[PDB]
Design a protein around this ligand. Structure first.
Ligand SMILES: *C(=O)/C=C\c1ccc(O)cc1
Length: 125
């Protein structure tokens, strides 16, 4: 268990150092996306919440292929604006319901320290 609290202000600084095995030790779900919304990292707790096998979704497009329910102004729209603006820091509640039991969560989207990468953090509410 990596001790990082959800919503921590310097969270992007802390996760820069972690490799994929260390990300799996977090208490919350973590998804790293590129600016086109392709999945670069997907940790163990996220596969717990969503039922997806982390290895099988890396490389897929989150908005197109994996999670069509987030293809809406309320989620995807915020991402596209953060990517275009080059800055992103937003938290909101949402319901995941594609091919799974409808599940309410707290989502935290934030730009990653690194280049063109963005974080999507998820925890149950
Ligand atoms: C909507 O589609 C929300 C999210 C999501 C993520 C992964 C999987 O497997 C289903 C749904």
């Amino acid at each position: 268990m990596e001790h990082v609290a959800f919503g921590s202000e310097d969270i992007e600084n802390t996760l820069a150092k972690m490799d994929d095995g260390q990300l799996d030790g977090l208490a919350f779900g973590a998804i790293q996306l590129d600016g086109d919304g392709n999945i670069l990292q997907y940790n163990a707790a996220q596969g717990d919440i969503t039922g997806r096998d982390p290895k099988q979704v890396i490389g897929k497009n989150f908005f197109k292929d994996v999670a069509p329910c987030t293809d809406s102004p309320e989620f995807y729209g915020k991402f596209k604006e953060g990517v275009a603006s080059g800055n992103l820091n937003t938290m909101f509640e949402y319901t995941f319901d594609y091919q799974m039991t409808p599940t309410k969560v707290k989502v935290h989207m934030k730009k990653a320290l690194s280049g063109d990468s963005y974080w999507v953090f998820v925890k149950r509410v």
